């Protein structure tokens, strides 16, 4: 039995204290602490020792993160092969990309559409992108998607998401893009849904001047599901819910079930959604093995992420090389 | 300037009168007075009458599907399939009410399974751990047994026999909204919200088809039966064509994520909606897409500047009943 | 075991068949079945032969809703003592008069406060009020004001809350106000932070040009518990959650626990408040008896109290005549 | 022109830079690198000196606490003192680095009995029908044995004799304000939020002080010994001079209900707060008070039109801790 106490700052200011004292505060500060625990968990199993791991981590994350400044957490992870598996939707990957190209600004969620649109701004959140971030990427893009369906006319390839996200992040060659890391660590990404975004656009548009690009689904889902029945052990991180959630938890119910689990979303499970779910939906499913501890802790992701991988992946920058 | 003032019950029972009375009741309430009516501005839309200027521009796409004034869309997430708001989305399909459907996987596995074998009510506190030593799955406040799966599967493999075999032998390029046609066309029960689809010339996208048990059975299919591919850029190609030869685009959004940003971007392609209602929980402090306002989507064109779009915030089982009830269904007469 | 199923417009529309399928159709619909029922049973309870009636209902509402047309629906049911005891907050009160002066409009979430400020008008939700409303308040309620301080002087009256609750209705004298039919049919209102809200500021101005008037909070909490005390059964029917949520339940706990209880509110759980918390937390407190099977309706009640109403209360007009 | 852009852990884990960084990362971590500037805007007007013009108005209230150029308002829902933000809160009374504290009933009661007695930590799966057979209350994911409000019963029990003697005997008039200063008196422990509160000055408003364990106490007793007043008339004169003859003021809240709304129409009498935080989990969408967002209060003048309020959309179990420590506990010295 733990006794709910709270940090002391007659004590002065230790950010390390003051983090850990979170697990004994009480609602969502305990869950953190919690979540805390589990990642290091995960990690303590990946260092293990038996490129296969000991533990297979899977990282989910929705589109928005990556627009805010989650974007650089989720680099460094992948940057320095932390986790072993990405799953993003498709805003999740193009605006890693254009970000190597033109910035996204800081605005407020109340600023009308009307203007917004007369200025050429577009909003997301309370963040702002240039209508004119979008064609620096077309004029970037257009040139490699002329590669690809000449490479899969000619040379045999059968495009799905993950490889041609692999691809995209080698071409961007900037040590700034999550994908770029990813595809120099053989970290894949499934995006099932990839045409749902700006770079479906492009493909759409190109299709016109160029036709016969293919993007398959089903070969991703094999890549996908054979990573985790392969494994020794896996541990799901997903900040919010969605694909990304679902994904990587179906992927995971086909080992039946995942040994450590650890979610960061807003979603409530009221309206009965899988986003909004609490994990032990997920037990009975058999996504999340029985004998598991998974956390949820209902907060934004970006204040909550960076804090999570202070205390647990950076912590272990060493083992990592 | 309107006041605010709630249905009276000493006026007695009047339930016309009473859900009227929503959009003077404030809050919630009253968006969803203002849903009502910008859905029946799509429907009254949607029964005026192509001029021959109009008509020759709608008539530049290849689908099959009679031209109208208002091209609408709806979108719903997975879990208001397993809800009852199937019947609710069968209903609209059914009589021609809606013109393009977008949902994810379990969307349209959930109404082809419901078809042999159903699903039941429960709580949502039910622990997952007695569920799957009993061989049943949660959903919300509702149960699904294991053995709905089996069937689907018993169902389901020789179709992706055929499938497979079709796209071998005869050439057939698989997409999502091809094989969700193919699957109500062999679910052949009119209480499949994709038998009448199919039957009624209604295409249904799913990018993520893969993202459920429909995945499952043809992950483990590939492996007896290889070499089944699904493009998802076709599909891209013909939901953005949908919109952009529409004369006027309505856009009819339960739940969040891809099933309504799919919805919306095909409309940025034509410069937006005309019309947009939508009905979700989600928040938008997280900056999510699921949860922003409807003026956010302004902002990128995919809901036109001119439009009066409205959010009402829910759970669209308790809504969506009522709001086809004050708006489609009332004009049944117009859709036979 | 109940199938799910939703209602079949191929049947046309039959509202009352429509409302019944909702018990059917899963999430908050099944809920919304649940709590139609368990508010039947509270009437069928009330109904029962045994001015005390074999179930004391106790109806709560945060103030905003009585700025909402809900006003109109809690008006109806107290007019024709369906309920037994109210529970609002100050702006619960004093908006029931004010309407009675003058009206409230519709609006818009997103009118800017600026803007809203210079033309004199503020802002509740998508509702709007303009500053003339408080004047006309200030013009009504001064001279009352002056007629209890004298009576509390000069004739012995200590006041409390719900006294002067009574007091306003029954000079409000307008048969649209929810206060002036709960005086005449002594159904009590209790609101313990009677001082929170526009009322106060009239006591508050008023008390520097006619000093002395007491309202004490404690005579308050001896009314309300002793209703719960001595009742053959209760009922709780919570709109919204905060002080009104509580002190209701709390008032419940004195007698080891309300017999039915539903609840429909916006509040989660996450942030371990007391408004959102699910019934089940009032379980462990006694709040609501074991044996009890409590519902909670999680939405906006402006959408669904009057459906409520219609399918429970207003079907039940002739027993209540 | 910001650009968003998230801490870079290759530079380590630098504390101090990572949660400066949030201000550039977006969505509610940018709103926290707002409140911190906020909050430390109002402690670098709190600081400020009084001019002889100011110094003559802000000491026109009976209250000895000694004048600042910046009166900042705490408020915090009971749940947060069950919470270990009562560490947090306590160290801000007890330094004087705020004026004013408002709260509801459990925020009072439950800082004095975990001077009897812990809390402890739990899961909000819990069961009630169990933890009630093993007498055990639960709050969120927080366990309170009912032995603790045994104790309390015992503590209080003579106080509140005291109390009614004083009142009939010595004339008292008493008001929650002056009944939490009471109670922070007599509790005589430093690890009490009210002990440090009543110390330094502070006073404290509950206007529905009944709505709780103390009230139950109150009920009881009044049946041996009755006869106890608690007035809510004087505690609102009380509570809004102190904003009437601020020189500045500021508003930090935690959680919506009484506690956001009393501090928020303190703030109407002078015309606006200058300067605002809010930190709470509610929405805006049922038109409730508490989840308004602060642009709604700034349409009635609780906050000045040119005030750049911030709310954080969290737990503040989470993000207060956080605030405190990059602005009040940064400035410590300044506070002794
Ligand atoms: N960034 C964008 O707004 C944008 C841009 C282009 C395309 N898209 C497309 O929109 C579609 C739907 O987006 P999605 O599925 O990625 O997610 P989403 O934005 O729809 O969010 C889904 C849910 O995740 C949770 N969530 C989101 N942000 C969170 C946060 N900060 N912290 C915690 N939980 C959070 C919420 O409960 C939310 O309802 C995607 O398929 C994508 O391709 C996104
Ligand atoms: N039925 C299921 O729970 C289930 C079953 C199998 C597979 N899946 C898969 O899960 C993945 C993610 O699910 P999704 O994208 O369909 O949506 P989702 O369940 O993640 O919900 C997305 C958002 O829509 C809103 N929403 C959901 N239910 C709502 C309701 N009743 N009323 C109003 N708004 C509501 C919420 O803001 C929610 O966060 C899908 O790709 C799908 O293939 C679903
Ligand atoms: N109407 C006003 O905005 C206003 C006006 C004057 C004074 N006040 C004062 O503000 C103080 C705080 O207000 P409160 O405690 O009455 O409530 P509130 O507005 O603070 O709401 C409390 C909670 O109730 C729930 N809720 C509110 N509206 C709901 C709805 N439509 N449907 C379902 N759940 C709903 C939400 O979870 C919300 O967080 C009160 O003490 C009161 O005197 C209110
Ligand atoms: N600790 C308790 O649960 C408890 C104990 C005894 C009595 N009470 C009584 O319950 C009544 C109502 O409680 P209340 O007014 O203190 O507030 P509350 O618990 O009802 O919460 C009000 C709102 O504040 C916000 N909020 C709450 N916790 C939050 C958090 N961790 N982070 C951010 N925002 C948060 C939410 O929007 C919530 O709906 C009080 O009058 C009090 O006397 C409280």
Same mark, same amino acid.
């Given at each position: ?10 004590? /002065? ?30 990690? $303590?199993?990946?260092?293990? &020792? ?29 940057? =320095? ?10 805003? /999740?990957?193009?605006? !890693? ?20 649109? $007369? ?5 997301? /959140?309370?963040? +702002? ?13 257009? &040139? ?31 040590? $700034? ?33 160029? &036709? ?15 990573? @985790? ?16 959630? =679902? =994904? ?18 807003? @979603? ?7 986003? /909004? ?25 970006? +204040?909550?992420? &960076? ?10 920058? !060493?083992?990592?090389?």
């Amino acid at each position: 039995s733990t006794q709910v106490r709270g940090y002391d700052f007659n004590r /002065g200011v230790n950010y390390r204290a003051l983090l850990e004292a979170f697990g004994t505060t009480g609602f969502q500060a305990t869950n953190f602490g919690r979540a805390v625990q589990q990642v290091n968990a995960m990690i $303590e199993k990946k260092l293990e &020792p038996l490129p296969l791991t000991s533990c297979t981590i899977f990282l989910g994350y929705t589109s928005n993160l990556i627009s805010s400044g989650i974007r650089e957490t989720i680099r460094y992870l992948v940057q =320095h092969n932390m986790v072993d598996v990405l799953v993003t939707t498709a805003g /999740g990957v193009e605006e !890693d990309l254009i970000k190597c190209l033109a910035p996204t600004y800081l605005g407020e969620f109340s600023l009308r559409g009307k203007e917004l649109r $007369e200025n050429g701004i577009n909003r997301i /959140g309370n963040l +702002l992108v240039p209508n004119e971030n979008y064609c620096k990427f077309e004029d970037w893009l257009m &040139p490699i998607l002329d590669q690809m369906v000449m490479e899969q006319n000619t040379e045999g390839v059968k495009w799905t998401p993950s490889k041609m996200i692999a691809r995209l992040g080698k071409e961007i060659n900037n040590p $700034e893009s999550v994908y770029y890391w990813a595809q120099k660590n053989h970290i894949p990404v499934f995006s099932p849904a990839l045409t749902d975004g700006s770079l479906g656009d492009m493909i759409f548009f190109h299709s016109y001047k160029n &036709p016969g690009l293919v993007l398959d689904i089903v070969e991703d889902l094999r890549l996908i599901n054979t990573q @985790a029945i392969f494994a020794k052990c896996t541990g799901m991180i997903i900040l919010g819910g969605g694909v990304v959630k =679902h =994904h990587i938890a179906n992927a995971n119910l086909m080992r039946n079930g995942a040994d450590y689990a650890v979610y960061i979303n807003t @979603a409530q499970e009221f309206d009965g959604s899988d986003s /909004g779910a609490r994990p032990d939906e997920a037990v009975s499913w058999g996504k999340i093995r029985v004998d598991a501890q998974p956390v949820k802790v209902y907060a934004d992701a970006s +204040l909550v992420f &960076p804090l999570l991988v202070a205390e647990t992946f950076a912590q272990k920058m !060493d083992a990592f090389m």
